[PDB]
């Protein structure tokens, strides 16, 4: 379960740079590796790579 935006608000700094929450960065890592694992299982990858 990925929480809503209220639990991880993207606070705007003095300028326009929108800083993301720690939860959002972590979910970014999770989605990155999840997509990476999904393609590695779908396409050519070694068993140790998937592991």
């Amino acid at each position: 379960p990925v929480p809503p935006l209220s639990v991880r608000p993207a606070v705007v700094m003095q300028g326009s740079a929108r800083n993301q929450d720690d939860l959002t960065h972590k979910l970014a890592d999770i989605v990155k590796i999840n997509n990476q694992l999904r393609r590695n299982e779908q396409n050519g990858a070694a068993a140790h790579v998937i592991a």
Binding site: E41, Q42, N43, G44, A45, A46, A47
Partner: protein, 520 residues
């Protein structure tokens, strides 16, 4: 008539029109039909590969082989350019079949599903495109097709594309791929093609990679240990043996004496980057963006696009008589000017290809700037105007040069009218430029043709050239012969951002064969 094993009689007049190799093909296709297996017609393009399907299906219908009384409803999936070409071909080489086109152009002018039903009931030959296959996997895969020919079937080379899955939803065993190059980048493409034609032969995709792609690839690298070279050699031979029955690949050397093609040439020209071109390239390689890409902070593709553009023309930045797309601003355009000058003086028809589409526009405005009468043909040119454009260019010699994007420019069009071919822009895919250059040197090309590959020395394009060479060697190692020489020129790393301009078997035959393979 000509007669084969069980009941296959193909009409004699039709047979006599064929060549010897095309006759072999027809026999091969029928043997597959007997096995109920599929195959890849990997004949090199121009070798009249399509005619073989016509002959075989004609013979099958005529023989009335016994669910189906001869030839049932069948679907042809071919690239959008060539649909009417196939219709024309069926119509001439065998009028009796009904060949319905499934397209916006089409000829039906009602709902399409009615047409699908009509063909599936009256047993026609439904031509369609890969898109309409992707978009009506539901409708189309409800009608017990008898044959599922895919022309230029390499488009199914991605096992996960939607079109691939849609094509692999068809149920009949009589699946055929007509693909001049059934392997273009790596064997994953091969597995995909075999999994359409013959779903189990090469195993699952993971297992295929594990067992074949990894070893065969590792044997190509320059630094590979000899042990690994020999594992690659073994695996490559196993693969050829596995795929031998189901791939009929006649190159244009085992038929040349029996077919009499003209001379072919493959010159390469290492173009030199002009001053402004050099400056923009030298700056952008030194730019922070390239440095960040080297650090892996974002996608590499952006950098590669930028570099290719720079080498292709300074269209990163535009600089009277210095308007956008000015020839003198970029060296390759200077070379093209000289070549088209000499060739126009030779009264010769040229065929200029470009991987890009907007660059095809800059080439177009150039050819306006010159007095060269051209005809341009890319993805934006209407499909209905496509085959008539090809026919027009082939019928008269008034049209001198023929701008082409390689993606529609390749893929089954016949362009025998042109004589000289120049590949202006490299690709990461060797097959693209190969089919491009092969548009001319086909059956019916009654005049000599030479191929010029224009390349920028020391820039990205040379490294892309190295990529497509390494790919070509990998394809050769598994299609033409596994004794390929190792690609020693480069280590093929991410240092391609630099500018370095010039200046019964009786169980002893078996065991002997086994010992041979396992000695490697």
């Amino acid at each position: 008539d000509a007669e084969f094993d069980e009941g296959f009689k193909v009409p004699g007049f039709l047979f006599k029109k064929l060549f010897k190799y095309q006759q072999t093909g027809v026999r091969w296709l029928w043997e597959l039909h007997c096995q109920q297996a599929g195959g890849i017609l990997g004949d090199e393009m121009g070798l009249g590969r399509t005619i073989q399907i016509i002959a075989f299906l004609a013979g099958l219908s005529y023989s009335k082989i016994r669910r189906f009384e001869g030839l049932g409803p069948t679907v042809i999936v071919c690239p959008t350019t060539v649909m009417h070409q196939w219709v024309k071909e069926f119509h001439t080489w065998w009028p009796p079949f009904r060949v319905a086109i499934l397209h916006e152009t089409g000829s039906y002018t009602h709902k399409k599903e009615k047409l699908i039903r009509d063909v599936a009931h009256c047993h026609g030959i439904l031509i369609t495109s890969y898109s309409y296959i992707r978009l009506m996997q539901d409708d189309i895969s409800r009608y017990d097709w008898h044959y599922v020919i895919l022309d230029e079937g390499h488009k199914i080379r991605n096992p996960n594309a939607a079109v691939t899955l849609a094509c692999k939803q068809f149920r009949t065993p009589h699946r055929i791929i007509l693909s001049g190059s059934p392997m273009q980048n790596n064997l994953r493409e091969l597995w995909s093609l075999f999994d359409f034609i013959f779903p189990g032969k090469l195993g699952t995709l993971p297992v295929f990679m594990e067992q074949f792609s990894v070893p065969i690839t590792m044997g190509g690298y320059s630094n590979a240990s000899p042990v690994q070279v020999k594992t690659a050699y073994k695996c490559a031979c196993v693969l050829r043996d596995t795929i031998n029955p189901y791939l009929l690949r006649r190159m244009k050397s085992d038929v040349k004496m029996s077919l009499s093609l003209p001379d072919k040439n493959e010159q390469v020209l290492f173009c030199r980057l002009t001053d402004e071109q050099h400056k923009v390239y030298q700056n952008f390689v030194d730019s922070k963006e390239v440095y960040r890409i080297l650090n892996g902070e974002m996608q590499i593709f952006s950098g590669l696009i930028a570099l290719r553009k720079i080498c292709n023309h300074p269209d990163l930045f535009s600089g009277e008589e210095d308007q956008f797309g000015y020839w003198k601003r970029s060296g390759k355009m200077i070379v093209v000017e000289s070549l088209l000058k000499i060739w126009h003086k030779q009264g010769q028809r040229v065929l200029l290809f470009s991987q890009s589409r907007q660059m095809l526009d800059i080439l177009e405005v150039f050819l306006r700037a010159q007095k060269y009468t051209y005809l341009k043909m890319d993805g934006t040119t209407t499909i209905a105007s496509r085959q008539p454009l090809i026919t027009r260019y082939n019928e008269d010699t008034s049209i001198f040069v023929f701008l082409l994007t390689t993606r529609v420019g390749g893929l089954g069009v016949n362009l025998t009218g042109a004589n000289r071919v120049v590949i202006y822009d490299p690709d990461w895919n060797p097959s693209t430029d190969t089919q491009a250059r092969e548009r001319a040197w086909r059956i019916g090309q009654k005049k000599q043709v030479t191929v010029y590959r224009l390349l920028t020395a020391g820039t990205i394009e040379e490294k892309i050239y190295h990529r497509q060479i390494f790919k070509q060697f990998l394809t050769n190692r598994v299609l033409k012969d596994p004794k390929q020489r190792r690609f020693f020129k480069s280590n093929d790393l991410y240092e391609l951002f630099t500018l370095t301009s010039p200046d019964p078997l009786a169980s002893s035959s078996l065991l002997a064969k086994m010992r041979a393979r396992n000695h490697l």
